[PDB]
Design an enzyme around this catalytic site. Sequence first.
Site, PDB file in Angstrom:
ATOM      1  N   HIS A 191       0.817  -1.205   0.000  1.00  0.00           N
ATOM      2  CA  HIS A 191       0.000   0.000   0.000  1.00  0.00           C
ATOM      3  C   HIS A 191       0.852   1.257   0.000  1.00  0.00           C
ATOM      4  O   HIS A 191       2.003   1.235   0.431  1.00  0.00           O
ATOM      5  CB  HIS A 191      -0.953   0.002   1.200  1.00  0.00           C
ATOM      6  CG  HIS A 191      -1.881  -1.171   1.220  1.00  0.00           C
ATOM      7  ND1 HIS A 191      -2.920  -1.311   0.322  1.00  0.00           N
ATOM      8  CD2 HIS A 191      -1.892  -2.287   1.987  1.00  0.00           C
ATOM      9  CE1 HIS A 191      -3.542  -2.461   0.548  1.00  0.00           C
ATOM     10  NE2 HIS A 191      -2.935  -3.074   1.551  1.00  0.00           N
ATOM     11  N   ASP A 231       1.349  -6.888   2.968  1.00  0.00           N
ATOM     12  CA  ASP A 231       0.605  -5.787   3.644  1.00  0.00           C
ATOM     13  C   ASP A 231       1.516  -4.661   4.165  1.00  0.00           C
ATOM     14  O   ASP A 231       1.171  -3.966   5.134  1.00  0.00           O
ATOM     15  CB  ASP A 231      -0.366  -6.254   4.755  1.00  0.00           C
ATOM     16  CG  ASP A 231      -1.450  -5.187   5.067  1.00  0.00           C
ATOM     17  OD1 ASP A 231      -1.714  -4.306   4.219  1.00  0.00           O
ATOM     18  OD2 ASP A 231      -2.011  -5.172   6.176  1.00  0.00           O
TER      19      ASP A 231
END
Lengths: 324, 326, 324, 332
Positions: free
Chosen positions: B10, B287
Amino acid sequence: MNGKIALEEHFATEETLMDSAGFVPDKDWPELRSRLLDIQDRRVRLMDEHGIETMILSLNAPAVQAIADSTRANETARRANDFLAEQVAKQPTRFRGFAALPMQDPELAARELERCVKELGFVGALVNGFSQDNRSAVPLYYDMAQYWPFWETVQALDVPFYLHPRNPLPSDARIYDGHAWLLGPTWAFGQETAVHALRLMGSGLFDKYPALKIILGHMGEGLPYSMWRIDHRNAWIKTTPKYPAKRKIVDYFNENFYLTTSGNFRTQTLIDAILEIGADRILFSTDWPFENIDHAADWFENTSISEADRKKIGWGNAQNLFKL
Amino acid sequence: MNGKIALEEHFATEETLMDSAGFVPDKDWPELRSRLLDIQDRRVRLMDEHGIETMILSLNAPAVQAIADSTRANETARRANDFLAEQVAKQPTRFRGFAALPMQDPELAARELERCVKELGFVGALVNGFSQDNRSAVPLYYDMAQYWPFWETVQALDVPFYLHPRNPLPSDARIYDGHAWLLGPTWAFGQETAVHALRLMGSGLFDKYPALKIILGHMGEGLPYSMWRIDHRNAWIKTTPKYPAKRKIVDYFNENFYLTTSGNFRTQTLIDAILEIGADRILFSTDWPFENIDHAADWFENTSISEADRKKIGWGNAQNLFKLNR
Amino acid sequence: MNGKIALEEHFATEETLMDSAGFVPDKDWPELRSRLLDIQDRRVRLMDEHGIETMILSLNAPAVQAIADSTRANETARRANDFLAEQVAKQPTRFRGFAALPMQDPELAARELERCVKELGFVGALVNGFSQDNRSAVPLYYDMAQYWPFWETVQALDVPFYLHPRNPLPSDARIYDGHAWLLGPTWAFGQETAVHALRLMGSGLFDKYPALKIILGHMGEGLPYSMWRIDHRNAWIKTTPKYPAKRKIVDYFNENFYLTTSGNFRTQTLIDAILEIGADRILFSTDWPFENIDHAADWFENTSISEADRKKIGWGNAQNLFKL
Amino acid sequence: MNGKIALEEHFATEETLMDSAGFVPDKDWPELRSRLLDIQDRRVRLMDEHGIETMILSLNAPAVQAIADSTRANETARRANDFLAEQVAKQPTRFRGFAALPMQDPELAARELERCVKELGFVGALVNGFSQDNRSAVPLYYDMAQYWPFWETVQALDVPFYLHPRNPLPSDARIYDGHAWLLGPTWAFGQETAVHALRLMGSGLFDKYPALKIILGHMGEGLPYSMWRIDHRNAWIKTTPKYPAKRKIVDYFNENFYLTTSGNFRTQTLIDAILEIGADRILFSTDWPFENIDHAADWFENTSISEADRKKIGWGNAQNLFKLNRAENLYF
Ligand SMILES: [Cl-]
């Protein structure tokens, strides 16, 4: 395998019978209803046919947890327990009882658990999730401070508390609106029970009462699979967890919980549970009459574990736990 | 193992940055902030140090899913996608993009996905659960009928849709009241996402569009462990399941879903997933920046699986899924 | 994890030292030799650094089993055992001893086991597979009838017997001719030891002495993987197995054997053993000094099992077994 | 599950029938004999009843490997292979053949494999362990230098070689003397085959012919459980392994081997093999007629693996390995 002990094995009284009506199709209700009311006859034949020596019996769901008047809840619990004691006494080598408790009032629940254990010879309690009470604007969960004297009583009696599912209340279930198929055993029961169990662990209840034993059915309601993540998510952050409990959640899971195989007859899932919590903390159970005794026993007979563990899960663990 | 592909990785724009604030303690926000904003520099050195060849990038959370004016949601999605495409273009061998999408409005979302795939070279979409839209009294879930024409476009484009978490709305979160520790990655993200995924499966969406590919992080948010029970509970009852889909839920999980290892670095959990969905449908991801790259890579390097499956989960599966060798 | 008990942990005396030479390359011999001889110093420092509370020590290999003169074998055993007792006595909380036995002569071995257990406080015996004896044209395996009074003695003492590897004799090793890389721990040790164990099982020894405890290193020398096949191959044939034992081979495996983790630091292998024999029957060990203590402990610290079973395999199982 | 492919499925000719005698009790010989001799009738009915679309057939054991006069071995292999081709052609959608080969003679074995693949349409070879040959004082193992040109031919043809068990010779079997119950499938078959396979890997054969594909039955004869230990024993020692091969044994196991489920219907063992070699390299097989088709199929139907892997192991892997969904097998 003969000699099994099974411990999520349900009955109803006429008083509580209709609570179970919502959970199967209309065409199957007469079958389910007849199974719920039968304790002495067909139930024991099926135990004989499928190698179960002893069923630890409990009332159906939500039963007492849905009786919102605490006086009425106590009265019903007491009637259900006296009935259960009389039923157990008819075939005392084949049955034991778990208590139904009026969790609406911690004090009444503690007193009824004492009566049940010391007077009726019951071997623990079974409670269907949160309680509804007219005096409370919110559902009652058992991590709340008011329940601490009750848990002190449980620990003093040294008998396990089986935390059984119920559905979330409608206002707490909007994610399932238009998707009623997810309610109940399909999914919603598991989420409701796992979170209630986590709330107990995070509350620090097991710091204060470290000898408590909590039982979960359904191989622990998804917990073992996600247990590592519960404590270890975002591990690069070095911080104190924001719950009142002093240790990691998995420490309480490892030390204070037992799982049963009820309604979760899946070898992959059992293997995952064995590799997370150990075979010593896993117990055979069926969830009769909501699940078939034959399905549960046949699956368990042949699942891919050591014979030493099949014995422990079959009866050895329960023998020790309930001092049988 | 070098050459890994990671796809739950991200970044934020200055515009979406504050959405990530308060996912970590205050003392750690400077570090999280710097990670979210850095694409070109330290992120790539960490990839080099931990054997990641390609990160498929996606915006942070809930980002567009919380922009309740659909017009503004679309404007934000477009700016974030254009930025992402610009950043991808600076190091094209090391990055791909997932689209951020204004799911508030199915037509706007389909149009934006088309632009991202055809004009920007994006390889799928990532969406943070349900949407808020001022026009709707209720949160929007993608099993709803209005989404069917959008899913038709997803299938036509033949790119995967990554269903990422967000928290339940406070009014749907009373079970966590007094227990905020359970919100977010601890538990609430998993429940919210597992249920949203099950809603897609039970709706019949995959009967209508059987070639769809949905991706879940966190080893499937608990789903593999309880998947048998989902269909097979109370098996003595012979009945047609009360959802519109025509088959068993596990049929669509097996045929339409992929899981990534993001934020769930647990060998027991991986083994269970392999024995339920198979290694062919499991994908390495980290992540980052919410999880460390070194933690994710070191765990995966040594997890107890065959080397053949280590290569598939590490890069082979993603290469086929995203046509990167193509 | 502090408090581990490790039980395949080797030393040599000057007398037996050279038996170990040529198991490792020449450049590595000085290191190995120093490890074999050191009991009190570096060894204990390493136990401290890697969380081992107690090492149950045993002589190297083949040692007594390669001494073909039975009188000489018994003299060597007594010296090694007396030395070991003196060594254990210097740090009595950190060590226990396994006996070396002159298995060449079943009466001498029984008497020496008795002296070791009764007078020296040893907690079992460790023997390097078959014995060579000048009086016997064939190697001596312990399922042979002459061993039965010895096994009666083991059972009466109620201490385990650790069946360690040695290589087959050259005339029994032609399959490895031109392929010496397969001898020793690579493969030949495992085949030799699995078959010796299986000979014990099929002989009916455990019908006659059902309380015997046999220990195998290296996670059972391949046994758990092929155990189903041992009994159940060609199942359509309904027949009595052609060995003298009364039950299935797996019954004796489940009831009479323990496995240790020595030299087999592989999580997949451990999970398969858990699912076949159960974690109650698996024990931590290293095979120091042939394997590093740090490698063994680091693997075992992080292997993919429950914390309950990590404690059992780490120390709990050994504590029970050896009555510590 | 319908559509399974099984590839350790045996028959005998009247010529080789007696090789299988004394494998089972006398009372069971009439049944075993009838199963071995039947290809066209009951065999196919049981395939229909237990969800097997294709059996890849092979001769019984030790058969050609025990014929010590290499000229006679070649003669028997040719006759057995022609018989199998004729049998397969009767029901070509249900059967394929593996070659029996006279491994006594590297040259003869290579020529017969060519003939079998090119003219008879066989899809691999199956050999029962080491060969006895009158010219050699020792049993012949296929890592030996003289076999390298034969393996060049295997790789050029790009068909798999199924290495099946046989018992050790009695002089190599003294550990089992007085313990005959350990001979055969119980244990000795496994040791014999695991070592023969390890000798191939250690020899460097797979360095020279890296595309070779070797098949082992019985879930790989114990190899997966002990594979870590094979390379990694005594790891503190930093050294070059004392075999001619350039890499680790496990590299060749992972890259050059397939395992079948024949005669090893054990879920724990399958899981272990999945986590060591991967489901992509595991193939359903039964070992009919020595194992029952129904036992094998029933176990495999319900074993604890993903449905995706059940399709791969049941038929997908084999379909791809033997190119059975391809033009040369479908239309020619
Ligand atoms: Cl030796």
